[PDB]
Design a protein around this nucleic acid. Sequence first.
RNA 1: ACAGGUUUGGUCCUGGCCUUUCUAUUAAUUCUUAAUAAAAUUACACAUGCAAGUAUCCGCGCCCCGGUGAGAAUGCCCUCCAGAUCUUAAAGAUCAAAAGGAGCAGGUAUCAAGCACACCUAUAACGGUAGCUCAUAACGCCUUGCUCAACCACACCCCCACGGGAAACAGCAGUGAUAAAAAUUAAGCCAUGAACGAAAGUUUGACUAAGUUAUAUUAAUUAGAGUUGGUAAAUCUCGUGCCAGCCACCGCGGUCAUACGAUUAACCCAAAUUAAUAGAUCCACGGCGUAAAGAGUGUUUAAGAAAAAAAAUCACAAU
RNA 2: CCUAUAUUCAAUUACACAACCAUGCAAGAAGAGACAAGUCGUAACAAGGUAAGCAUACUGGAAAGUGUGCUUGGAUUACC
Lengths: 169, 109, 112, 213, 117, 51
Amino acid sequence: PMKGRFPIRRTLQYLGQGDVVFKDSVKVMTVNYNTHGELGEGARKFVFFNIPQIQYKNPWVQITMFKNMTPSPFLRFYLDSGEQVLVDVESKSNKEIVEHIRKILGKNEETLEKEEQEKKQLSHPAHFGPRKYCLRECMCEVEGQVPCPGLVPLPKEMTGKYKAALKAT
Amino acid sequence: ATLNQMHRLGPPKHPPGKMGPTAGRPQLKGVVLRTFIRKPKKPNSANRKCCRVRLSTGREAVCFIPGEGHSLQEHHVVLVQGGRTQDLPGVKLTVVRGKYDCGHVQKKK
Amino acid sequence: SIARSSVHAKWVVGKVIGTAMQKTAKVRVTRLVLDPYLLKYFNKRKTYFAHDALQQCTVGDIVLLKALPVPRTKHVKHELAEIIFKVGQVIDPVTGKPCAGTTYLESPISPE
Amino acid sequence: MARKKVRPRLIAELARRVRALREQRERPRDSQRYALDYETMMRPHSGNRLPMRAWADVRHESRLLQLLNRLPLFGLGRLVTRKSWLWQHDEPCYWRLTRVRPDYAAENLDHGKAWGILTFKGKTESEAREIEQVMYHDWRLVPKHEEEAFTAFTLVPEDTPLSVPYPPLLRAMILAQRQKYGDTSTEEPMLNLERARIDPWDYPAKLEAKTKT
Amino acid sequence: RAYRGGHLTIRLALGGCTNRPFYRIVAAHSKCPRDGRFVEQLGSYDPLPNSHGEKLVALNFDRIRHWIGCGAHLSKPVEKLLGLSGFYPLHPMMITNAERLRRKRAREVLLASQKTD
Amino acid sequence: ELMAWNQAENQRLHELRLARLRQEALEQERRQAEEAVLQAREAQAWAQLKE
RNA sequence: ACAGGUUUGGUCCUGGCCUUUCUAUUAAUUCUUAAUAAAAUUACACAUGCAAGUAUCCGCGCCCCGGUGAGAAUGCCCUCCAGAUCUUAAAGAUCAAAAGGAGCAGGUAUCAAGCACACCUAUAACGGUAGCUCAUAACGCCUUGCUCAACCACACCCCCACGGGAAACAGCAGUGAUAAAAAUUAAGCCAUGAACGAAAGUUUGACUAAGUUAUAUUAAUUAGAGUUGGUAAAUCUCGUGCCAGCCACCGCGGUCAUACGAUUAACCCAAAUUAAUAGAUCCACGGCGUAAAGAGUGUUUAAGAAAAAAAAUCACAAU
RNA sequence: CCUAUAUUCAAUUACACAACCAUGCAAGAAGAGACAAGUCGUAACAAGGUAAGCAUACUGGAAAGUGUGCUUGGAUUACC
Ligand SMILES: [Mg+2]
Ligand SMILES: [Mg+2]
Ligand SMILES: [Mg+2]
Ligand SMILES: [Mg+2]
Ligand SMILES: [Mg+2]
Ligand SMILES: [Mg+2]
Ligand SMILES: [Mg+2]
Ligand SMILES: [Mg+2]
Ligand SMILES: [Mg+2]
Ligand SMILES: [Mg+2]
Ligand SMILES: [Mg+2]
Ligand SMILES: [Mg+2]
Ligand SMILES: [Mg+2]
Ligand SMILES: [Mg+2]
Ligand SMILES: [Mg+2]
Ligand SMILES: [Mg+2]
Ligand SMILES: [Mg+2]
Ligand SMILES: [Mg+2]
Ligand SMILES: [Mg+2]
Ligand SMILES: [Mg+2]
Ligand SMILES: [Mg+2]
Ligand SMILES: [Mg+2]
Ligand SMILES: [Mg+2]
Ligand SMILES: [Mg+2]
Ligand SMILES: [Mg+2]
Ligand SMILES: [Mg+2]
Ligand SMILES: [Mg+2]
Ligand SMILES: [Mg+2]
Ligand SMILES: [Mg+2]
Ligand SMILES: [Mg+2]
Ligand SMILES: [Mg+2]
Ligand SMILES: [Mg+2]
Ligand SMILES: [Mg+2]
Ligand SMILES: [Mg+2]
Ligand SMILES: [Mg+2]
Ligand SMILES: [Mg+2]
Ligand SMILES: [Mg+2]
Ligand SMILES: [Mg+2]
Ligand SMILES: [Mg+2]
Ligand SMILES: [Mg+2]
Ligand SMILES: [Mg+2]
Ligand SMILES: [Mg+2]
Ligand SMILES: [Zn+2]
């Protein structure tokens, strides 16, 4: 787009390139940050940039931002078990915040790979049906098998009218 | 129009197509109620063959009879289409030639 | 351990709107929703009813809510779990000291 | 589902109560319900015709309550059998009548509901079960001087094999399954038949409510 | 859709082309239409012979045995196909049909011999 | 393990924060020292003017 | 959109309409055979035929399949599942009502207030609080099936179905009325799905094999339709002369027509060619001094940005 | 109630009941457009011959005229 300070962050590619996936126990991320002082430049840049990337890959996690109540910027992760994860961000940078969050509460590369390997199993290559869920519609189009009657007409010996005609006489 | 205003108003959607004199039907079956002559607009002068019919929907509207020469009288069943005549204001219907009582144009013999 | 709720909001955070109801708090949770056209995240508000047995929530509190295993009524399905930030009286979780906005009421560099 | 504008339908629930009351008040008594026209083999109540394979038996035999109306205590402890059992099964199969409730609406008293103890093929059941297919025209009664002689049954063990070979592909599946883990045993795998025992079609079923445990 | 009852059945759904059948071996509810909603697809069945001349049939044996242990009923042609595959014992209907075919060949050769002299 | 690591990280950052805040307090004391010596000058001049 | 035609003596800019592309119906002209897919006017009323049977009686199924889109902004996706069915000793598997919600969801704010839509007590009764929703669209009005391995709703109507109108094809075929809309009142369970029976086996207007239809793609046994002023490929000769008439927009008709009617010739499609109506697509991440737009002014609620650092207050006619 | 079961009742009662609307017709009234015969003036475009226009008030067959504030979307041609 054109409107906005950074039009790039409002694109599907930017939202998809941010790889931060929370665990199933993660429910709430409450970020508290200030709008003044040189200490909180990293927290402000984190709120400006990385919140959309985290939100895109965690749609069910509620993220709430708060401004100018606590003098120290921090994050509070509310889990399913009730444990509150307190993350102090005073001089951390924008990339350091993301790396710290992924370290403390996130999903490993192998964990993501096993989920996607399970997901690709649902679509099965040998199944038949519509093009949305299956690769083949009718089994005629397979090379070695009988062609589709709407493309190559079948011989008179395989048509049902000739079989009825021969039985009639 | 700031981003907040665009989000508040939503994306623009194209309005639905307004129905024409035929109320969305390609053709309408009618009975001729008065055959007469109407004049064109200012830039060009003629004497067009116009008719007044009763459409199957119960609406009474004016139509135009294309072609040179016709034999249409009272209580005659014809079919009209959404042909708009540019020279005649308010006439948005044209009688289909080659119908029950409005047949094809005859050649001068 | 048969204690489950049918609502998706297992745990939510919101601001207290009104406390006119007796032992019942009216909270507003703000979530981030993506606009399919602008591709931008906007704050969508939703009102929730919560049970405050002790009646301590005032107007302006940041409140955590846990999904109630059984709904007491057809509109109350949550309970007040903890108050995160009391209005006007904020305690910094990282330092444990009272703060007034961006200013420290009690400096942590003076233990005694 | 659940909307804000859901109308509180009352006639739909009133009809449930009306039909519930009419089901019990106008309950068709089993006498006229199971009444039978012996000329057309046409049920006057339901409107169904009898199967053609049951045409001889209706005119040539009798039902349970048709023979039970001539007993003093409505057949307490008596043995009753079926002619179909007499034909198909050479082993004694009988019903020990423990209680009978005949209908009072029948003006010949040949209809009712009876319970008892079932002993099929000599195997005795230690539980009380309801007697099925009472209206069938196949029942026969045994006399008192044959009550003891009919019970004479010899207990012969079955010769059914307890294990069978697996189908070819399925058997090869296990032979490949254990070989991958490294089981060098070449023992022939069997399929058990201990729990595969099933009752024949002539075995009647219980008509009591099943208790969910 | 909502049903009052019914049972899970592994059957064949005729999804194909005119004068060119093709069955999908699928596990579906008993009260649903033949080509309607199903639970999980298992395999394919090709009624016509191909260029090489084999009748090609697919079985997803693992899911089939899983569902059958779960309580899936079976249809008669599915039983014939499974018996031919070797996963299940041969259906007696095939055996009696083979014996009937044997008797038809015997009577055919008898009549052919008697009609020639 | 991760949550103990987070607790240790937070305590470390709190220690650096206290170290910074003490220096900030010293600088604030210097600011008080300058403002007091100024307000002594402007306060006395107004008193002399009004006297 | 790779655009083009079109405002003006003329140029630039702004701005609307139309053309160029694809699909579906009806109408006109023409038409030869096959294959495949689909058969689409009606929730107006139906003559007649068939469509639920199975079985040693009991019983089991009997809008299940199939048909339709009237109502509902209905609904899409997601948790919990009562209950029903298959087999078991339990447990498991399918359908899954009711209750909801993280989220999404037609137009209309000239629909801005709705009018009882809320909470605690301990018991399932008394009472006390003054509440609840809503401009992030509540409460209202209108329209419509749909986000499709599918899903939702209906079965003559009274939303229901005790009862009242009253004798029911929104099953397969067919008949009246209506409409621009036009399939056989035909054969079978051989193969699938369903129902029954332990079973050989029976039924199934579902389904299969067919009959009819240029509604559409392919092969060919077939050649007709449209157009020839610009957009936009292509006209020679006659007749009329602002008359007859033609056009999607500009527009053409002068005893002066490559635009009207006919002939020749030519161009593009092709068993199809045009006309009409519907669609897909098409408005603004663009502007607001002169073309439509900065609302007569200030403060404030809700809401939003505080992204690096600074400041506040002085002659003169505020009120 | 020496084996165990049968029957019954679920119908009424008090009030507004076409108000509110939707679709056509209607004695009639008014408006807008196209304005193929026209009649009456010349309001605006040139300091359009009284400079135009805005708000408002009054008056007049009519375009319009005038009063009070406001604008240049008019000039005062510029050592005058
Ligand atoms: Mg036209
Ligand atoms: Mg014709
Ligand atoms: Mg029956
Ligand atoms: Mg077909
Ligand atoms: Mg102009
Ligand atoms: Mg047609
Ligand atoms: Mg349907
Ligand atoms: Mg409605
Ligand atoms: Mg359940
Ligand atoms: Mg459910
Ligand atoms: Mg209005
Ligand atoms: Mg509708
Ligand atoms: Mg009904
Ligand atoms: Mg009907
Ligand atoms: Mg019906
Ligand atoms: Mg029909
Ligand atoms: Mg008809
Ligand atoms: Mg048609
Ligand atoms: Mg016809
Ligand atoms: Mg016809
Ligand atoms: Mg037939
Ligand atoms: Mg069949
Ligand atoms: Mg059969
Ligand atoms: Mg075609
Ligand atoms: Mg000429
Ligand atoms: Mg022409
Ligand atoms: Mg042309
Ligand atoms: Mg011409
Ligand atoms: Mg524009
Ligand atoms: Mg303007
Ligand atoms: Mg202004
Ligand atoms: Mg104004
Ligand atoms: Mg004037
Ligand atoms: Mg002058
Ligand atoms: Mg003048
Ligand atoms: Mg004058
Ligand atoms: Mg003047
Ligand atoms: Mg002037
Ligand atoms: Mg004025
Ligand atoms: Mg005057
Ligand atoms: Mg005067
Ligand atoms: Mg001027
Ligand atoms: Zn095919």
